[PDB]
Amino acid sequence: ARPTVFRWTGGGKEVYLSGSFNNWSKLPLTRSHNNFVAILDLPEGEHQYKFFVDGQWTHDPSEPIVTSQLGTVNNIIQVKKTDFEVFDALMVDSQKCSDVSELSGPYHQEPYVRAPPILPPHLLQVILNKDTGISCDPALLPEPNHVMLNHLYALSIKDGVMVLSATHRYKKKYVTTLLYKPI
Amino acid sequence: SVYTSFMKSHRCYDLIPTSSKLVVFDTSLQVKKAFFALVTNGVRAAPLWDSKKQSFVGMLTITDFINILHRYYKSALVQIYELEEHKIETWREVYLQDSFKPLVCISPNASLFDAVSSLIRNKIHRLPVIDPESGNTLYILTHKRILKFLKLFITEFPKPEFMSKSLEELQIGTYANIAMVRTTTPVYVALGIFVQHRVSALPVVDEKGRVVDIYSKFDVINLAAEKTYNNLDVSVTKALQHRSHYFEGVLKCYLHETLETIINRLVEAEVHRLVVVDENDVVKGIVSLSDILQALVL
Amino acid sequence: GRVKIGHYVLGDTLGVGTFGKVKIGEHQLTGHKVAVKILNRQKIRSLDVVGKIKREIQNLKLFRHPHIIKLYQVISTPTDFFMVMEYVSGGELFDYICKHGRVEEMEARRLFQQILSAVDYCHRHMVVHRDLKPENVLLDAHMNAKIADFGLSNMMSDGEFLRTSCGSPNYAAPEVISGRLYAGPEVDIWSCGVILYALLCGTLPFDDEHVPTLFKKIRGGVFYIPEYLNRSVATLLMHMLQVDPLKRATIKDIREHEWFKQDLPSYLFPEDPSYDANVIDDEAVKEVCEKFECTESEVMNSLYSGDPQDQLAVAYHLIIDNRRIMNQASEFYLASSPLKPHPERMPPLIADSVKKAKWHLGIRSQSKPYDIMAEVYRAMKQLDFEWKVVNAYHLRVRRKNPVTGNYVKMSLQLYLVDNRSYLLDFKSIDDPRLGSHTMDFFEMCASLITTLA
Ligand SMILES: Cc1ccc(Oc2nc3cc(-c4ccc5c(ccn5C)c4)c(Cl)cc3[nH]2)cc1C(=O)O
Ligand SMILES: Nc1ncnc2c1ncn2[C@@H]1O[C@H](COP(=O)(O)O)[C@@H](O)[C@H]1O
Ligand SMILES: Nc1ncnc2c1ncn2[C@@H]1O[C@H](COP(=O)(O)O)[C@@H](O)[C@H]1O
Ligand SMILES: Nc1ncnc2c1ncn2[C@@H]1O[C@H](COP(=O)(O)O)[C@@H](O)[C@H]1O
Numbered sequence: 001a002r003p004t005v006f007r008w009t010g011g012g013k014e015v016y017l018s019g020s021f022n023n024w025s026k027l028p029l030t031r032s033h034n035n036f037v038a039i040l041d042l043p044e045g046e047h048q049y050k051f052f053v054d055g056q057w058t059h060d061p062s063e064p065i066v067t068s069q070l071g072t073v074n075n076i077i078q079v080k081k082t083d084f085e086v087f088d089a090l091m092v093d094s095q096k097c098s099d100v101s102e103l104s105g106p107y108h109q110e111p112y113v114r115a116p117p118i119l120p121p122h123l124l125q126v127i128l129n130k131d132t133g134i135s136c137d138p139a140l141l142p143e144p145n146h147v148m149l150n151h152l153y154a155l156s157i158k159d160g161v162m163v164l165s166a167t168h169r170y171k172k173k174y175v176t177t178l179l180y181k182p183i
Numbered sequence: 184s185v186y187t188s189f190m191k192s193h194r195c196y197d198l199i200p201t202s203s204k205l206v207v208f209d210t211s212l213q214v215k216k217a218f219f220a221l222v223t224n225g226v227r228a229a230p231l232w233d234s235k236k237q238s239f240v241g242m243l244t245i246t247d248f249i250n251i252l253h254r255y256y257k258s259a260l261v262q263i264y265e266l267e268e269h270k271i272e273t274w275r276e277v278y279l280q281d282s283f284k285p286l287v288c289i290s291p292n293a294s295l296f297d298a299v300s301s302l303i304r305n306k307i308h309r310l311p312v313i314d315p316e317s318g319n320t321l322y323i324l325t326h327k328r329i330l331k332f333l334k335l336f337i338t339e340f341p342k343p344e345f346m347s348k349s350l351e352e353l354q355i356g357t358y359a360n361i362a363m364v365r366t367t368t369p370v371y372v373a374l375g376i377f378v379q380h381r382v383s384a385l386p387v388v389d390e391k392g393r394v395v396d397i398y399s400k401f402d403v404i405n406l407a408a409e410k411t412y413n414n415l416d417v418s419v420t421k422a423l424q425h426r427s428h429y430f431e432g433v434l435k436c437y438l439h440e441t442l443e444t445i446i447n448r449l450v451e452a453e454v455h456r457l458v459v460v461d462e463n464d465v466v467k468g469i470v471s472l473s474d475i476l477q478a479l480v481l
Numbered sequence: 482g483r484v485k486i487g488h489y490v491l492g493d494t495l496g497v498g499t500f501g502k503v504k505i506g507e508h509q510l511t512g513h514k515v516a517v518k519i520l521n522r523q524k525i526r527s528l529d530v531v532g533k534i535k536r537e538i539q540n541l542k543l544f545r546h547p548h549i550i551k552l553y554q555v556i557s558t559p560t561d562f563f564m565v566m567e568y569v570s571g572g573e574l575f576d577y578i579c580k581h582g583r584v585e586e587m588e589a590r591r592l593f594q595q596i597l598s599a600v601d602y603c604h605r606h607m608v609v610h611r612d613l614k615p616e617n618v619l620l621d622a623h624m625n626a627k628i629a630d631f632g633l634s635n636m637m638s639d640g641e642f643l644r645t646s647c648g649s650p651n652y653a654a655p656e657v658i659s660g661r662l663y664a665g666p667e668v669d670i671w672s673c674g675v676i677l678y679a680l681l682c683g684t685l686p687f688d689d690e691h692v693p694t695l696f697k698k699i700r701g702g703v704f705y706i707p708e709y710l711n712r713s714v715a716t717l718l719m720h721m722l723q724v725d726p727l728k729r730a731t732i733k734d735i736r737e738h739e740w741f742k743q744d745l746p747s748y749l750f751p752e753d754p755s756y757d758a759n760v761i762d763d764e765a766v767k768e769v770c771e772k773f774e775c776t777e778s779e780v781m782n783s784l785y786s787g788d789p790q791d792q793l794a795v796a797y798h799l800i801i802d803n804r805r806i807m808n809q810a811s812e813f814y815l816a817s818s819p820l821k822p823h824p825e826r827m828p829p830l831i832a833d834s835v836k837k838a839k840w841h842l843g844i845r846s847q848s849k850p851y852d853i854m855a856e857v858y859r860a861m862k863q864l865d866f867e868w869k870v871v872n873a874y875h876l877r878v879r880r881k882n883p884v885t886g887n888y889v890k891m892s893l894q895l896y897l898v899d900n901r902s903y904l905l906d907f908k909s910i911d912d913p914r915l916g917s918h919t920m921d922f923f924e925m926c927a928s929l930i931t932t933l934a
Binding site for chain 3: 001003004005007028030032033037038039062077078079080083084085086087088089090093094096097101105106107108109111112114115116117118119120121122123124125126128129131132133134135136137138140141142143145146147148149150151152153154155156158162164165166168169172177179181183
Binding site for chain 1: 212
């Protein structure tokens with residue numbers, strides 16, 4: 001089954017759906033509080049359709065339209081194979097989102113032309129200032145908070161060497177590396 | 184048998200702590216500064232990063248400290264100039280010399296069998312675990328860490344038959360040419376014994392030959408912590424007096440004692456070797472984590 | 482004339498969630514009820530949240546916890562996604578409290594233990610719910626609690642903070658109402674504090690008809706604790722409703738509290754006797770089906786419906802047994818807190834020829850923030866750094882490592898710490914190979930730090 005939703009949100013007392021799939025006969029729609037909907041099994045490819053609301057043909061503003069040689073205007077929807085697998089649909093949708101984001105950046109050297117965010121307290125818990133019980137292996141540390149990972153910590157430059165450290169995850173385990181670099 | 188397939192089943196990753204700290208030295212760091220950084224950070228070994236080669240080129244351990252002291256020390260009346268002037272890079276140029284001695288490491292996804300194999304083949308006590316995908320060093324693997332890990336699982340498998348055999352019956356450890364120092368032996372002589380016979384610790388014995396103390400390579404770094412490294416004429420006894428109030432004595436074992444007994448004693452005491460003695464405490468040999476891990480992979 | 486989606490007839494709206502409309506559905510053969518969350522595709526694209534929906538679908542799909550509403554399938558259409566979920570008939574916890582007044586201590590504790598179990602399950606999966614409240618806790622016919630609406634949830638990323646302020650103010654922690662950055666598991670626990678309070682007393686700890694007044698009460702953190710509650714649970718409330726996020730109780734705190742431990746079922750938390758035999762471990766099912774080539778659905782079928790001696794099952798159980806041995810030596814994998822000394826404990830360094838140096842975060846400077854940034858731009862220009870501007874105070878920097886040929890990336894962020902003093906924070910980015918990613922990050926930071934002054 002390839003379910004396709006036909007939803008009319010514009011109110012009215014009776015709404016019917018007509019299109020190429022039913023040979024342009026009026027299909028009564030189920031009403032919710034507002035929505036009038038039908039979910040049909042449709043083959044992939046192009047389908048033309050129109051809503052009939054309270055005795056009047058009315059187009060759907062949400063979908064594109066097509067005019068025939070004799071002047072009738074219908075909505076058309078496109079049923080694509082990518083619509084029936086959710087991750088294929090999301091991949092298509094994420095491509096359409098990157099496309100609009102092009103018409104609205106690289107690395108560069110130009111500077112920029114409202115206070116800074118307050119520093120969050122978690123970054124002031126310094127894992128190398130914490131003491132460990134003397135009974136355990138001096139290389140063991142407490143489990144870090146996920147939020148302090150990858151941030152740089154340091155000691156004041158003294159005697160020409162700078163010491164840097166940070167905590168990085170490998171799989172489910174955590175390593176705090178110190179580096180002693182002469183300046 | 185069964186402990187061998189256990190080692191082959193587990194990657195080194197499983198031995199890595201959940202959270203641990205690791206100290207790296209750039210090769211251009213002054214070697215004296217680096218030994219101090221070991222003391223202040225509480226770790227006994229550091230990986231060595233060469234920022235020109237952009238590669239890990241080796242490890243700095245306490246044995247480097249012992250090697251620098253034994254070679255360049257002259258008298259308590261003069262400074263040891265090469266310890267103050269040497270960068271790690273220049274010291275390695277002097278020490279390494281002819282030996283190829285490239286960096287020995289192991290992947291996190293390699294088996295424990297491969298770790299013990301690497302430790303024994305290269306005769307080292309520290310195998311750095313480098314992740315090949317990020318190039319990062321993760322942890323410094325040791326014999327203690329492998330044995331304690333195995334001890335956790337001995338209840339999970341049928342226990343072999345040799346675990347109940349005595350140390351005498353299995354001939355595990357070194358029973359001949361034991362390197363020892365007397366109670367009055369100066370530190371500098373002990374350092375020389377460390378360099379000549381490559382061994383992790385020297386039992387300290389009285390005049391009649393029974394062990395009153397033990398001088399590990401680890402205890403040498405107290406020379407760095409107390410900055411007493413400039414006088415090596417003092418005795419091993421005076422070098423260990425800082426330890427006297429919390430020292431409970433030398434962990435020993437007899438030859439009639441079972442190998443499982445030995446393993447539990449070492450894992451619980453977290454030291455690298457036991458001193459095998461007789462009734463009267465006179466030393467008949469050494470049994471080390473080297474011997475024990477080697478025997479379990481044979 | 483019925484609206485069917487994938488064998489289910491769609492009924493009335495149960496409610497409109499944070500994102501999407503939930504309708505009931507009834508199996509056209511067996512009558513089985515489900516709850517169908519509908520998401521409009523065009524809405525998702527217009528908000529550019531496609532990625533957040535995809536990640537939300539991948540995560541809720543592998544979430545299997547008895548107190549989290551399960552997702553059964555997702556049915557895709559040209560215009561809409563349908564998310565078929567477990568239906569529960571008890572309605573909201575909010576309606577239960579309202580109609581009963583207060584809730585008796587033994588039942589209130591049972592519910593709270595179930596709710597907290599699901600929250601801990603989310604956090605251990607790196608998800609924070611952020612909408613926690615009695616209207617989003619549903620009951621089944623048996624009075625078991627189910628957390629439901631994840632529309633506001635977010636993944637917790639390493640090194641990153643959450644800003645977004647949304648949800649009901651009454652359940653909002655003092656930091657979210659202030660607009661500060663937070664880690665996010667602390668904010669869920671605050672909400673569990675308000676739920677616990679609403680469970681025991683029929684009322685909210687912080688409530689006012691005047692909304693700015695409500696915000697002052699929450700920020701102050703003073704609330705009335707009635708005398709019909711015993712003191713142990715009073716301690717548990719003040720620990721969870723603590724105003725300082727660093728002083729606020731964690732899940733491990735709560736699980737160790739005496740009032741919470743009483744009559745606690747063995748299955749709700751991972752360190753507890755019955756957890757392994759009940760709650761599936763998603764990392765072990767991924768591991769077993771790495772060894773054998775099989776789907777995650779086959780491994781779960783031999784555990785649920787299968788014979789214990791199956792090879793998928795024995796592999797799975799063997800991983801769980803090994804992970805129990807390792808977890809039960811925590812001393813071996815983790816440092817303790819402040820006893821015979823470990824043999825490798827080092828003595829302190831003594832003076833010179835000693836003070837304990839203190840690590841600090843990043844770089845502090847008292848220059849005006851616009852002046853700090855200009856010196857950052859100047860230093861990077863001198864160093865051949867290419868960079869992008871997320872905002873005025875946030876930069877994404879990169880440099881080509883000349884030896885390795887790899888690119889190394891970093892995030893610079895400026896913060897306000899004290900009144901007029903500021904701090905520049907350095908954060909690594911990642912995306913066989915020579916060199917080291919962590920060294921590359923240290924040497925890049927080191928270059929920048931020296932150039933400044
Ligand atoms: C809040 C919100 C969420 C989602 C949304 O998009 C959709 N609403 C839908 C409703 C239905 C629907 C409509 C009427 C129905 C049924 C079953 C019986 N009846 C009578 C299902 C369908 Cl088939 C797809 C939809 N897509 C629109 C809104 C909105 O803003 O209204
Ligand atoms: N993984 C390694 N790779 C290369 N050399 C090492 C390694 N581990 C130790 N060494 C060398 O061995 C000496 C000390 O050995 P150890 O007995 O492991 O402390 C050091 O001075 C190093 O030169
Ligand atoms: N003090 C010592 N005297 C003689 N042999 C030793 C001594 N310490 C260790 N050995 C042996 O040297 C090998 C490795 O020792 P270790 O340095 O403890 O790894 C093992 O075969 C030990 O039994
Ligand atoms: N058999 C032993 N008895 C008592 N202390 C020991 C023994 N082996 C090592 N130690 C001490 O344990 C610390 C670490 O030594 P190691 O076993 O070489 O790592 C040092 O303080 C040693 O002196």
